Every structure is written in structure tokens, then in C-alpha cells.
Amino acid sequence: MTHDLIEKSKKHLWLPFTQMKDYDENPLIIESGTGIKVKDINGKEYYDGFSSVWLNVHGHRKKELDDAIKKQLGKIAHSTLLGMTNVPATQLAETLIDISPKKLTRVFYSDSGAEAMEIALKMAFQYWKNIGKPEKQKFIAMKSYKAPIPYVYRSESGDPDECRDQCLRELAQLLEEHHEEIAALSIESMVQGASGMIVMPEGYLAGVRELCTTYDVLMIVDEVATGFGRTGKMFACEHENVQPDLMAAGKGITGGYLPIAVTFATEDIYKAFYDDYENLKTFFHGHSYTGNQLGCAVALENLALFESENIVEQVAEKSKKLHFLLQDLHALPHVGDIRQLGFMCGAELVRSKETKEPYPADRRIGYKVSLKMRELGMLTRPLGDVIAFLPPLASTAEELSEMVAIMKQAIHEVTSLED
């Protein structure tokens, strides 16, 4: 029965990033998917409006991807990368090196995007110790030490450039007086995802790259949310032509089918761990399913679809009519901000335009909208009161428009009643 599936789900599960009480009152259990839609156990279909949490590229039950996994099963599902390697992980690594910024020449596999970033930090940490400067041991976290990222929406000036230069100036001052103790800087690539789909103003990222080079601090670029076509580029750091020292990737790498993550490094960083085992230069980390054949085999096929379906350039083109559709959401009294880079978008809801006072958090306004969209046939995740919109890269222009329409209807319906 379907009512006992539901019952067993709230008895045995503990779900990530969710208040289980919320899950218990509004369960949803997915059974299948095809194209850009998923279907629950009652047969109700939804638009994957968030690409299963921004990792689904070509939709579900993408035949080429289905076949690439079946093909790989005919050989071997998993052999280890500890001390040795396998065919698909080696082949993928070459293809990954080709499509990434030019100075990134090394691929270290891991199991999640979060582990890839932790790996980037250990690499940066050990890097300085290995080249004889163990005083460089602190990190700059871009919101250790904290530096501000520009958020133009709520921001005294409301100016992309003033916000850019003012934040850069704060970074610049932090380096000036701490840099000799700092190993690295970690920053999302063009878009702050979880912090509300906040797009960086032009010149900002190229500007922190520049400061990092000047202060001998490694720059870690997190591309887990933005990588593989999401922003209309293969990697988002191309928007500003920045070369990372370290780059984390995952999610869409497999077209969204399986867990694979990568930390890219430069050759200069790589060679600081290359030496006789005796002189202790080895980077002692890495997991047990790292470079899983099944995940690498579906990734290879994923990147073959990018190149044979000009996916990145389709995203960039489709993003043009998407712009106008999203900008029309401003017609609603409780929108307030619309942010977009490629298929990476957010609509920040407010109780009042130009005070921009948010709703009190206890009004659950992002969550109520997510729930309304859900009854309307569309899945997405609210980040606070920002409605995220990250549809599959393979999303049609008509599918794009159907999704924005459901989103607009949901925002209006919840929000018309709040105040």
C-alpha cells in the first residue's frame, strides 16, 4: 500500500536539512521521472523546478545516460583509486582537464561536493607546510576570517560598482594585515547559492582573484552549484575569466545521476606533494568510492551530450527569453528582487517594496510558496524567503515558461494573504 509507504517513511527516515515535523505533515515520495518531470507514488507529476537540487542536467530517464551505465556494468561497477586507478576515472580526468580553466591540470576525485571543498582546504593547508611556510594556516571565508561579498539588493547605494569596490576594499584591507598567516580564500563562483541566489556584480570575482595573487593566498573556487553549464558557461568562473588555484565541482558532472565530485588543482600545487614517500610530502586523504566507474562512465556520457547538444550555448540562448519572463514577476507586490545568471535564478519576496522589509521569518513564506507550487505541479526549494529557480539545462522554452507561470501563480496566491 501507498499509505504504509508513507507511514514507514516517517517512522524510519531522518531527512537532510529538514524539520521532520514538516515532512510528516506534508510527505512527498517520488517514484519515477521522465524528461523534466518527477512523479510521486499517487501518480501526481511535478516539474523538477530545482533540477533535483541543481544537479539534473538533461532530465530524468535520459536514454544515453541510461545506456552509459548499463554499458559500464558489463565491465565493472567499482574498483579502487587508492594506490591504483581504473579506465573511466582516467578517461574522465583527461576530459575534465580539457574543459576546465587552463591552469587546472589535476583531478582529485571525491564522493560529494562538500568533501571536494574540504579537500581543497587540506590541499591549500598542506601546500604551504610542504613548501616550508607553516605560518600560512588560516583561511578567508567569504560570507578563519570573514570578508563581505556584495549583495546589491540590500545595500545602501544599490550600485553594482560601488558595492563591488567597497567589498574589494574590505578584502584588500584584511589581506594587507593578515596575509602572511593565510593559506587560502574560499568563494563561490559568480553566484551565492544557499545564501539566496545572489549574483556577483561584474568585476568582483576577477577582483578577488587579483588580490589573492597579490597577497600570495590561494584562491579556492566553489563550482559545485554553478559548474557544468548552469550559468550559461561550462564553469561560471569563465564569466570573469578567472583561473582558480583550486576548484571544487560535482552535482551536474554526472548529469545528475550519481555522486561524483572533483577537486581540480594547478600543477604547481600538485608538485608540492610529489617527492619520495620518505620525505612526507604525500597528501593523506581521499575516500573509498572515489572515482567510482559507474559515476565516471555516466559523467563521460554527460559531457559528450554537452558537446553534441551544444548545451552551454542553448542555456545562454534560452536565458534571454527567460530574463523577460522572470522580470515580469516584479509586477507582483511582494516580489522585490529578481536575480539571474543563466538558469540560476531567485525571486526574493518581501512584505514591502522599497523598504524591502522582509516578512517576519515566523510567517514561513518561502516554505508556504514551495508548498503551493507543489500542489500546482512544481518542485523547488525556498532559501529563506527567496524562491530558487534552477530548471534542468535541457528545459525547453515552453517548459521554462510553464514553470515561471506556476511560480508566479504560487507567489501571488500565498503572498496575497500575508499582511
Which residues participate in the annotated binding site? 113-114, 222, 286-288, 381
Between 112 and 401, name the residue whose CB sits nearer to its own copies.
112
From CA 59, how far away is CA 250, in angstroms rounded? 17
Interface residue with its own copies among 1, 3, 43, 83 (CB under 8 A) is 83
- The interface with its own copies within residues 283-302 (CB under 8 A) comprises 283-290, 292, 294-295
Cβ atoms of 248 and 263 closer than 8 Å: yes
Q: Which residue has cell 507514488? A: 41
Q: 306: which 3 cell numbers?
A: 554537452
Say how many residues make up the chain.
419
Count Cβ atoms within 10 A of the Cβ of residue 245 and give its class: 0-12 exposed, 13-18 middle, 19 or more buried: buried
Instruction: Tell me the per-residue interface mask from 220 to 239 with its own copies, x by CB under 8 A, - otherwise.
Output: ----x---------------
Of 68-76, 162-170, 238-246, 343-351: span binding its own copies (CB under 8 A): 68-76
Between 23 and 145, name the residue whose CB sits nearer to its own copies.
23
Interface residue with its own copies among 36, 101, 110, 388 (CB under 8 A) is 110
Interface residue with its own copies among 36, 49, 101, 107 (CB under 8 A) is 107
Is 204 a binder of its own copies (CB under 8 A)?
A: no
In whole angstroms, the minimum distance from the beta carbon of 191 to its own copies comes to: 16
From CA 81, how far away is CA 287, in angstroms rounded? 9
Q: 198: which 3 cell numbers?
A: 545572489
β-strand 246-249 against 45-47: which pairing, if any?
unpaired
Q: 354: which 3 cell numbers?
A: 522599497
| 3-state DSSP assignment of residue 60 | strand
Is 344 a binder of its own copies (CB under 8 A)?
A: no
Maximum CA extent, the chain: 69
Is 333 a binder of its own copies (CB under 8 A)?
A: no
Binding residues for pyridoxal 5'-phosphate: 113-114, 222, 287-288
Between 201 and 255, name the residue whose CB sits nearer to its own copies.
255
Is 195 a binder of its own copies (CB under 8 A)?
A: no
Is 17 a binder of its own copies (CB under 8 A)?
A: yes
Interface residue with its own copies among 32, 144, 241, 310 (CB under 8 A) is 32
From CA 23, how far away is CA 298, in angstroms rounded? 32
- The interface with its own copies within residues 234-273 (CB under 8 A) comprises 250-251, 256-259, 265, 270, 273
Between 19 and 416, name the residue whose CB sits nearer to its own copies.
19
Q: Which residue from 262, 226, 384, 297 is spatially nearest to 66, judged by alpha carbons?
A: 297
Q: Which residue from 216, 221, 206 is spatially nearest to 265, judged by alpha carbons?
A: 221
- The interface with its own copies within residues 348-407 (CB under 8 A) comprises 362, 364, 367, 370, 379, 381
Is 44 a binder of its own copies (CB under 8 A)?
A: no
Q: Which residue from 68, 67, 86 is spatially nearest to 78, judged by alpha carbons?
A: 86
Is 23 a binder of its own copies (CB under 8 A)?
A: yes
